[PDB]
């Protein structure tokens, strides 16, 4: 009964509201501010010990410890200041593709092609790290996992769904469905009340944790989006896709703000991140280096060269002091 | 100096972790990793059964050599996002059913499409392929009632199974655009003693010898 037609009418009337809402661009608003100038960073620490390629890393809230995962089947916690190894956890399955660090610092999580998320307890009276819980129920490979709290974790999987788990019980509470392609990334808001995910249908969605509902949908990109990250304020986020293009979205205006592209870049974007104040945007590419963009002027400010292979993971510490970068040549570098 | 009593003890702990990471890493370099692929019910179960959700790993030993096979079937997601995790395998095992040339769910052309994609993949530009042709004793009986012209309209030949089997093997080997640095070994699966694992041992030993020669520059 014209059910398909009503959806088309709703889709059209939505885009007119956005067009009527748009009256200015950031290019003309931000044209009268001083650029950041040249930005040069030097490598300070090089961490070695992984026998295979690093697929993920995550900083600690204390801004000293750092967990990283590699395909050789090991999780290593590092001491950044002294380049010491604090722990080394052997994994049951070597096909690990994501890892996370608990905000309290008592747990770490990992997952991959085994369709299971494992949680390890670091503070044990026996003096060794042991598996605390295994969460099963996803029908596709785990793409991302983030500790929402010491007892809650949110996980995105390759079966086009996201779930929220209760670690103590072992059962998932709410399920977030609505994506068409595989979900590749997620990012938690600084207030830990909302989160955003990007999928292979070239769309991003904003979800509410408590209600389990989708608030907004964004469809600015053209290809698969692999990275996503909130602004430090929490009212915007940036996405990186396979068309060698990064884009900035606004939640309040519910549309796009800026595009970060170059004529000499053809390689896809692997990871994206923001600085402490949000003026700088860090992006890693497949052409073996990283670019520092000016998030307000959309012009390049510097490059981070020194990796011999694909830059797979990238993270900025909580106080904005250092940037950690991993790659497929089995090395970790810290820049300052 | 500048290190305290507790800092010196932490450094000594880190050296012990380095030693453990070195010894187990060297141990894993003496294994041989294999990848199993196929088109649905191609007979992969029979191959695994001879040596007795997610990914399945099988270990077995043959003549002082350790093998590991990974079965990546059953994962209901596109392989473009996780196939690069298997770059560096010694060889790839592909299973094909000879008796599926008339069943449709035409499915033989579906397996040929999968073979073409994996053979000419950018990641797998140098790994060798060991091909298994299953259901030999069923294809011979089915060829006496259903002509091969159903699957291959351009096939002009006899109805003998030896003639038909040679034609099918030729079509699979001609999809390889990397005629150099990539070689295809073909075998018709049989249940006579352990000839199936004997062939895999012969093919992998040939792969390793040719890999060593390339490093020295001799080949």
């Amino acid at each position, epitope marked *: 009964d014209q059910l398909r037609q009503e959806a088309e009418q709703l889709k059209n009337q939505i885009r007119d509201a956005r067009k009527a809402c748009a009256d200015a661009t950031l290019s003309q608003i931000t044209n009268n501010i001083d650029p950041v100038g040249r930005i040069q960073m030097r490598t300070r620490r090089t961490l070695r010990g992984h026998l295979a390629k690093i697929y993920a890393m995550h900083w600690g809230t204390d801004s000293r410890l750092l967990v990283s995962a590699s395909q050789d089947g090991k999780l290593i916690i590092w001491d950044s200041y002294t380049t010491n190894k604090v722990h080394a956890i052997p994994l049951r399955s070597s096909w690990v593709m994501t890892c996370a660090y608990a905000p309290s610092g008592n747990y770490v999580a990992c997952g991959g092609l085994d369709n299971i998320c494992s949680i390890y307890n670091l503070k044990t009276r026996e003096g060794n790290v042991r598996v605390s819980r295994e969460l099963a129920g996803h029908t596709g490979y785990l793409s991302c996992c983030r500790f929402l709290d010491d007892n809650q974790i949110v996980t995105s999987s390759g079966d086009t769904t996201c779930a929220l788990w209760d670690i103590e019980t072992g059962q998932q509470t709410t399920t977030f469905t609505g994506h068409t392609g595989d979900v590749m990334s997620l990012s938690l808001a600084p207030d830990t009340r909302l989160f955003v995910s990007g999928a292979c249908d070239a769309s991003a969605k904003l979800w509410d944790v408590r209600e389990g509902m989708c608030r907004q949908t964004f469809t600015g990109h053209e290809s698969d989006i692999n990275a996503i990250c909130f602004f430090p304020n929490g009212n915007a986020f940036a996405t990186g896709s396979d068309d060698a293009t990064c884009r900035l979205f606004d939640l309040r205006a519910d549309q796009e703000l800026m595009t970060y592209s170059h004529d000499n870049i053809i390689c896809g974007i692997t990871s994206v991140s923001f600085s402490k104040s949000g003026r700088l945007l860090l992006a890693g590419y497949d052409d073996f280096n990283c670019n520092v963009w000016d998030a307000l002027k959309a012009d390049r400010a510097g490059v981070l060269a020194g990796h011999d292979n694909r830059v797979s993971c990238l993270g900025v510490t909580d106080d904005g002091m250092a940037v950690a970068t991993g790659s497929w040549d089995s090395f970790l570098k810290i820049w300052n | 100096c500048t290190l*305290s009593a*507790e800092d010196k*003890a*932490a450094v*000594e702990r880190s050296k*012990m972790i380095d030693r453990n990471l070195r010894e187990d890493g060297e141990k894993a370099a003496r294994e041989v990793k294999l990848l199993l692929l196929g088109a649905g019910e191609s007979g992969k179960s029979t191959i695994v059964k001879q040596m007795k959700t997610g990914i399945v790993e099988t270990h077995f030993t043959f003549k002082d050599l350790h093998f590991k096979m990974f079965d990546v079937g059953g994962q209901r997601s596109e392989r473009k996002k996780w196939i690069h995790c298997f770059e560096g395998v010694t060889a790839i095992i592909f299973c094909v059913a000879l008796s599926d040339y008339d069943l449709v769910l035409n499915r033989m052309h579906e397996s040929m499409k999968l073979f073409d994609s994996i053979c000419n993949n950018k990641w797998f530009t140098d790994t060798s392929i060991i091909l298994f042709l299953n259901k030999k004793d069923l294809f011979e009986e089915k060829i006496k009632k259903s002509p091969l012209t159903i699957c291959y309209p351009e096939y002009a030949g006899s109805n003998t199974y030896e003639e038909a089997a040679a034609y099918i093997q030729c079509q699979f080997e001609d999809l390889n655009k990397r005629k150099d640095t990539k070689e295809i070994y073909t075998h018709f699966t049989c249940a006579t003693d352990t000839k199936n694992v004997q062939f895999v041992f012969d093919a992998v030993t040939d792969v390793i010898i040719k890999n060593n020669l390339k490093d020295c520059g001799l080949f």
Partner: single-chain antibody
Amino acid sequence: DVQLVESGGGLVQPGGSRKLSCSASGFAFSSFGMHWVRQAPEKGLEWVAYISSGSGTIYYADTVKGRFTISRDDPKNTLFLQMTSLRSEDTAMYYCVRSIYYYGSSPFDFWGQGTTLTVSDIVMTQATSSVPVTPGESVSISCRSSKSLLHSNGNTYLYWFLQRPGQSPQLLIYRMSNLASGVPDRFSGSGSGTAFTLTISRLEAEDVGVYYCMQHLEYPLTFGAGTKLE
């Protein structure tokens, strides 16, 4: 459960030799360093020897060098100490202490039960030998150091222990500020440089005992005399 059991504490004629053993069960014995600490019948604690993980490092007290020998057997989870040329001053009670060293750990967490043997530097000063007090009142314990315990990395190495009557010592505060797990949140540590203070809020019948402060800065480990509360 974590347990350390000692054996070999008989009576020894002067100039003799004896063997002491420490059997550990309930934890990964190979990842922990071990200390030997003895206590005279009326005096306080004193450190004897130390052996690390992997047996790579061995340390001795200056008064037992060339006389004692410490070693461990990982497969059997046993720590044993060989004593030679015993004298009348080696009449004490020997403790087995476990210790692990990495960023953010708590050394000296678990002590053994003790075995008795009868044969027949930074000076740490405690303010008062005894303190009489009634429950429900705040009491402060302070001890002084000859050399500054603050390192260049920003860590102050002072530890606090509690000796309950007829019981092995228990860790309360490590690195002068951190509170050990399982300790009620009414013990507070403070101080800077050479003077440190331990504050007890809402004292009850469980705080009666002897308090010791130890430094973990240099090669030998030194304890204080000990403050008694009534």
